[PDB]
């Protein structure tokens, strides 16, 4: 089926992720491997693997150069890649050439100890670069209208540095290939439910994409990583984001709209789906109607983390002002399978009922670190897909 796919790294690609930090107790290798074993075992889903997609020669040669250690050969070989190759045009539409040099540089500089530690949250192996790109390849090179991909995370990656387990911003590049693959740019909408703020992806959209039409609903808790609240955004947009509702502000910069759903200020009303994701759906219910009666299409991007679950034990989702948040507060500020299952079910319903307006869906794995929590949430996620987005058997 070209209509939907589910993307995991291959054996080799996943294997070259050891020592790569996660905000949990396991490295990113175990973490992603566990999810992949589950996804392969859950019967028959349309599952694609980063080993089968072969890149053009010049990519395979930049890779090869990285392996033998010639930092000037790699630096040069990459500089001379075709400016119109599908990967690279999107890659350098969001990432500075100096960052990519420094990165290639780190991968090779890493080959000694098998790993090069940049800062507390950023490690690279020799093959980090090959995988980051072999990942970005397969998503770019595959015509799936509803893409769920399980790889290394992205919404903290900046146009110019890496931060917090993120090395490049695969989401923004995927938006790049959408502005250019379409005749008229699609109306963009992002909903990122990872409990840590999409600080990175946000900077890249203010900087390089403010002219595209993007509605970006960013759900996070200004109390965990990275401690940034509305005052911090004000200094970022050097404007003052107006309050639209449940202590949630919006900023406009040219054609980009950024909504900050802060989970501290937005607490839940006894029973019913968490107000944070009800606004996420009120705004995606509307963005669909706007683009219908205007005729344009919509590309829908879900950079989703599960550390926003109440059942997350990772420090970066649960250590709130000096102590670990507890089961009472956790249920008033985080999400439970009730909330999530409703959300995913609603999202796909809007899609199925508006395949004339909603165009592509891309869901990409950000946070969610506790093993028994994320394995349960995944089973939920796979079951809603098996029901809504797959032809029945
Ligand atoms: K987020
Ligand atoms: Zn996160």
Author numbering: 26 to 418
Q: What's in the article?
A:
Classical Zn2+-dependent deac(et)ylases play fundamental regulatory roles in life and are well characterized in eukaryotes regarding their structures, substrates and physiological roles. Structurally, these enzymes are composed of a central eight-stranded parallel β-sheet flanked by α-helices on each site, known as the α/β-arginase/deacetylase fold.
We were able to solve two crystal structure for two Legionella enzymes of cluster 3, L. cherrii ApaH and L. pneumophila ApaH. These features might be needed for recognition of the enzymes by the type IV secretion system for secretion into the host cell, or important for interaction with other proteins such as the methyltransferase RomA or the lysine acetyltransferase KAT7 in the host cells, which calls for further investigations. Notably, LcApaH and LpApaH are able to efficiently deacetylate several H3, H4, DLAT and p53-derived peptides either containing a positively charged, a negatively charged or a glycine residue at −1 position, showing a low degree of sequence specificity, which indicates that these enzymes are capable of deacylating substrates other than the previously proposed H3K14. Moreover, of all the compared enzymes, LcApaH and LpApaH were capable of removing l- and d-lactylation from lysines (Kla) in both tested peptides, the H4 peptide LGKlac and the p53-peptide QPKKlac. In LcApaH and LpApaH the XGGY-motif is conserved (LcApaH: 388-EGGY−391/LpApaH: 391-EGGY−394). The structures show an open active site entry due to absence of oligomer formation and, as a consequence, the missing in trans supply of the active site lid as observed for cluster 1 and cluster 4 enzymes. Notably, for the cluster 3 enzymes LpApaH and LcApaH we discovered the highest discrepancy in the inhibitory potency between SAHA and TSA, with TSA inhibiting the enzymes almost 80–95-fold stronger.
